[PDB]
């Protein structure tokens, strides 16, 4: 059981060592499409690339590339698209991906500005009456409503395909209080946020996969998917303590490199799953 494993690694301060074993054990697959010179300006970070085997393809004949990975967790019956925070030139591609994958929710775990730099383009409208048009992908986006709380904001958005005049409602879940450095002290507001995404229906098999991002789509985004998948597997298995976080993380790393960036994010993931297990047992 992980509670005991937590105390061990914590009391022995072995987090950096566990983290290094995960780094060593992690899969490495080709990412040839990401490294094509024509895709250089579609990537926020040159060292963060989707693997070719799990990458999301855009349905445009010209250039199908977006920095986005499908993470398929077979036993948990959960899928997630993990992506980078859009660039000024990829906002249209981002919403094209949301449209084409039939996603119901977008989960954002960063602020647009952190540490005095832009971590993400402003890719949604700030006011009801000022809609955004993406001329390159023929999509219109309208803010319908915005519910601002202490730790997170939920926004209802209408996405309209200008080519076919279909419209869908998208929910934008924006966790606004992840600190500039380190991890939250307590996982309580993160768990509350995760239960709110679940309650929306956004993670349900009726819909396309949820889109999850931070700046690179590997660190905070990683913590989100890992916590969700681990808690769901604890519901599903005869023996909930058979759930090994490290194994789940390694299975997720077959689909996108670098998920969980620091030993602190790993410790936080254990804490989130341990605490979430109380609200689930
Ligand atoms: C790194 C690759 S592209 C890029 C960019 N595009 C627009 C703003 N920053 C930064």
Q: DSSP readout, 222-245?
A: HHHHHHHHHHHHHHHSSSGGG--H
Over its C-alpha atoms, the chain yields an Rg (Å, rounded) of 19
Residue identifier of the C-alpha nearest atom 1 of ligand 1: 44
Q: How far is the CA of 106 from the centre of ligand 1 (A)?
A: 22
Tell me how long the chain is: 281
The two structure tokens encoding residue 63: 């250039």
Task: Tell me the C-alpha distance between 267 and 7, whole Å.
Answer: 11
- Backbone torsions φ then ψ of 89, nearest 5 degrees: -90, -5
- Provide the number of structural domains found in the chain: 1
The crossing angle, in degrees rounded to 10, of helices 245-252 and 220-236 is 120
Q: Is the CB of 41 under 6 A from ligand 1?
A: yes
In this structure, what token pair is assigned to residue 76?
A: 């948990």
Query: What's the CA gap between 14 and 158, in Å, rounded?
Result: 47
Q: Is 45 in the pocket of ligand 1 (CB under 6 A)?
A: no
The 10 Å Cβ neighbour count of residue 3 is 12
- Resolution in angstrom units: 1.9
CA of 246 to the centre of ligand 1 (A): 33
215: helix, strand or coil: coil
Give the annotated binding-site residues for substrate: 180, 214-220, 261
**Residue 185: DSSP 8-state:** S
Token pair in block for residue 91: 């906002």
Ligand 1 atom closest to Cα of 41?
3
Using alpha carbons, list the distances in angstroms from residue 269 to 185, 231, 248.
12, 11, 11
Q: Which atom of ligand 1 is nearest to the CA of 42?
A: 3
Annotated binding site: 180, 214-220, 261
Q: Which domain holds residue 132?
A: 1-281
**Which of 87, 92, 94, 216 is the best mutation target for the ligand 1 pocket, counting ligand atoms within 8 Å of the beta carbon and taking the most?**
87
Look up 214 and say whether it is catalytic.
yes
How far apart are the CA of 86 and the centre of ligand 1, in A?
10
Supply the residue whose CA is at minimum distance from atom 9 of ligand 1: 87
Q: Which of 40, 44, 66, 121 should be mutated for ligand 1, with most atoms under 8 A from CB? A: 44
Q: Is 43 in the pocket of ligand 1 (CB under 6 A)?
A: yes
Give long-range contacts, CB 8 A cutoff, 24+ apart: 121-128.
121/85, 121/86, 121/87, 121/88, 121/90, 121/91, 123/86, 123/91, 123/94, 123/95, 124/155, 124/157, 124/172, 125/157
Is 212:229 a contact under the CB 8 Å cutoff?
no
């Amino acid at each position: 059981e992980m509670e005991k494993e937590f105390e061990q690694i914590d009391k022995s301060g072995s987090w950096a060592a566990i983290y290094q074993d995960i780094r060593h054990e992690a899969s490495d697959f080709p990412s040839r499409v990401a490294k094509l010179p024509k895709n250089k300006n579609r990537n926020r970070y040159r060292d963060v690339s989707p693997f070719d085997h799990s990458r999301i393809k855009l349905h445009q004949e010209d250039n199908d590339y977006i920095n986005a990975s499908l993470i398929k967790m077979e036993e948990a019956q959960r899928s997630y698209i993990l992506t980078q925070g859009p660039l000024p030139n990829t906002v249209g591609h981002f919403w094209e991906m949301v449209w084409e994958q039939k996603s119901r929710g977008v989960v954002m775990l960063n602020r647009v500005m952190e540490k005095g730099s832009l971590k993400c383009a402003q890719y949604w409208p700030q006011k009801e009456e000022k809609e955004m048009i993406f001329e390159d992908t023929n999509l219109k986006l309208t803010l319908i409503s915005e519910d601002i709380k202490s730790y997170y904001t939920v926004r209802q958005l209408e996405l309209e395909n200008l080519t076919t005049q279909e419209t869908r409602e998208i929910l934008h879940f924006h966790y606004t209080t992840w600190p500039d450095f380190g991890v939250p002290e307590s996982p309580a507001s993160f768990l509350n946020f995760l239960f709110k995404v679940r309650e929306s229906g956004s993670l349900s098999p009726e819909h396309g996969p949820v889109v999850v991002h931070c700046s690179a789509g590997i660190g905070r985004s990683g913590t989100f998917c890992l916590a969700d998948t681990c808690l769901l597997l604890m519901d599903k298995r005869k023996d909930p303590s058979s759930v090994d976080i490290k194994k789940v993380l390694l299975e997720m790393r077959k689909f996108r490199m670098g998920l969980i960036q620091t030993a602190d994010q790993l410790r936080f993931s254990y804490l989130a799953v341990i605490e979430g297990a109380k609200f689930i047992m």
